[PDB]
Amino acid sequence: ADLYYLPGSSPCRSVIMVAKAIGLELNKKLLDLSTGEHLKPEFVKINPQHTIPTLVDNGFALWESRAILVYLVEKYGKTDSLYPKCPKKRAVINQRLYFDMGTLYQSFANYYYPQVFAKAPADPELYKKMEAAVEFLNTFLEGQTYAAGDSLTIADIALLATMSSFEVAGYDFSKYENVNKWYANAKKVTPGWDENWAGCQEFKKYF
Amino acid sequence: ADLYYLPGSSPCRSVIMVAKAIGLELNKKLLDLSTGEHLKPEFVKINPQHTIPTLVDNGFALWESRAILVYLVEKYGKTDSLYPKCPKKRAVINQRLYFDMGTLYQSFANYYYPQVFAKAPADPELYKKMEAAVEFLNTFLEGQTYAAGDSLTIADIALLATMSSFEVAGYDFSKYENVNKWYANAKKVTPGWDENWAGCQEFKKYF
Numbered sequence: 001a002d003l004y005y006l007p008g009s010s011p012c013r014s015v016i017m018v019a020k021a022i023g024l025e026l027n028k029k030l031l032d033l034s035t036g037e038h039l040k041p042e043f044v045k046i047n048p049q050h051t052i053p054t055l056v057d058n059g060f061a062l063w064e065s066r067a068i069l070v071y072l073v074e075k076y077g078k079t080d081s082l083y084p085k086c087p088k089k090r091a092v093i094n095q096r097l098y099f100d101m102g103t104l105y106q107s108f109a110n111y112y113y114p115q116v117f118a119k120a121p122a123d124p125e126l127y128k129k130m131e132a133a134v135e136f137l138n139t140f141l142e143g144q145t146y147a148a149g150d151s152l153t154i155a156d157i158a159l160l161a162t163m164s165s166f167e168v169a170g171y172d173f174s175k176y177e178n179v180n181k182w183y184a185n186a187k188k189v190t191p192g193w194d195e196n197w198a199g200c201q202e203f204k205k206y207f
Numbered sequence: 208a209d210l211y212y213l214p215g216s217s218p219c220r221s222v223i224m225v226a227k228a229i230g231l232e233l234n235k236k237l238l239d240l241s242t243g244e245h246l247k248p249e250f251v252k253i254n255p256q257h258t259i260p261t262l263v264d265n266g267f268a269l270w271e272s273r274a275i276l277v278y279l280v281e282k283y284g285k286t287d288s289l290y291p292k293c294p295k296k297r298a299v300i301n302q303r304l305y306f307d308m309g310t311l312y313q314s315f316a317n318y319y320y321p322q323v324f325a326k327a328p329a330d331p332e333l334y335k336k337m338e339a340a341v342e343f344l345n346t347f348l349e350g351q352t353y354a355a356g357d358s359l360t361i362a363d364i365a366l367l368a369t370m371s372s373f374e375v376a377g378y379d380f381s382k383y384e385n386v387n388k389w390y391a392n393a394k395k396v397t398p399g400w401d402e403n404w405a406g407c408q409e410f411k412k413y414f
């Protein structure tokens with residue numbers, strides 16, 4: 001399988017952790033977005049939305065990090081523990097995946113991107129939206145070790161890419177006791193944390 | 208199964224169409240956002256994020272519309288046509304769902320919500336981003352009657368709630384040939400479209 005990717009990109013680093021956790025070897029291919037390499041007809045033909053991460057699996061094209069996480073586990077995972085079959089457990093993991101995209105990482109992008117990519121000054125009402133997101137995650141984590149169920153899942157792995165993006169950008173989330181404890185634990189147990197951490201240093205350069 | 212909803216809300220209307228599509232009668236519970244009902248300890252105890260739609264299915268709490276679509280189809284669907292078992296088919300549906308939330312509906316919300324809910328003026332740069340989203344949907348649909356396969360899926364139903372939202376907000380998508388054709392066919396074959404359209408006139412009051 002091919003993975004078009006940049007190491008700094010959080011949704012790329014989530015795919016890379018899941019591929020490591022299930023022991024799947026990916027053919028990794030850098031795509032220079034600041035160059036506009038992704039807008040090539042070469043890559044549009046693979047993915048008309050021209051986004052990373054994109055996977056090509058024996059010619060089947062797939063994008064959206066979180067659709068890829070599900071598919072890699074479903075098709076390729078030896079056990080279904082990262083994404084269990086039980087629809088209730090799956091359903092909690094899916095909700096946590098939509099949260100990670102539209103609440104958590106979205107608030108993160110919204111606050112930090114305009115500072116680093118368009119130079120605008122910090123907007124303190126987007127700061128609050130961001131903290132209100134982490135607070136939600138804190139709440140989800142109450143009395144829990146992992147984000148969904150009592151087990152490492154693709155929900156943790158996705159949220160781990162996102163929350164390591166938070167740290168490297170300078171957001172101290174120590175005040176959220178459950179998130180901090182989950183973060184500390186997730187680094188110890190997630191396969192390919194160390195690769196994700198390396199990739200966060202390329203992401204750190206934006207700041 | 209109880210569903211806390213408001214009939215104008217697109218993510219609620221998407222769930223109610225899927226329920227209709229599979230023959231599931233929900234107990235529909237109007238949750239009055241306009242009067243803070245969702246923020247009270249009773250609803251916060253069901254969903255700590257206090258968002259609609261929220262399903263309560265025999266004790267099991269669940270939110271995020273697109274998690275609910277999958278869960279309903281997996282549990283109550285007579286067949287799996289709306290969400291097939293095959294990981295590759297499933298993966299194209301999941302990508303469109305993440306597309307729906309994170310690209311299409313997101314652009315719509317960014318452009319229109321500051322106007323209707325905060326009374327900010329229209330932002331022509333957020334307008335452009337919203338048009339680029341519709342163009343990507345047009346591309347996805349080249350040569351296709353449906354959004355993610357040869358058949359109607361939960362991907363078309365989610366997308367149908369979003370695009371009927373675009374309609375009553377006044378967005379002109381006459382210009383996208385593929386979107387036009389798909390939208391016309393979807394209104395025809397999708398169960399509960401008529402009720403969706405009724406709920407859209409409630410949303411349209413905000414304009």
Ligand SMILES: N[C@@H](CCC(=O)N[C@@H](CS)C(=O)NCC(=O)O)C(=O)O
Binds near residue numbers: 049050053063
């Ligand atoms: N929701 C997507 C987010 C992907 C994304 O944001 N990609 C950006 C990273 S900079 C990108 O490729 N931007 C360039 C473009 O859209 O053309 C996912 O989870 O995979």
Ligand SMILES: N[C@@H](CCC(=O)N[C@@H](CS)C(=O)NCC(=O)O)C(=O)O
Binds near residue numbers: 216257271308
């Ligand atoms: N991404 C969610 C969005 C749901 C959502 O944002 N619901 C709003 C509708 S007004 C809500 O309940 N907001 C009130 C609140 O967030 O407290 C989904 O698709 O279910």
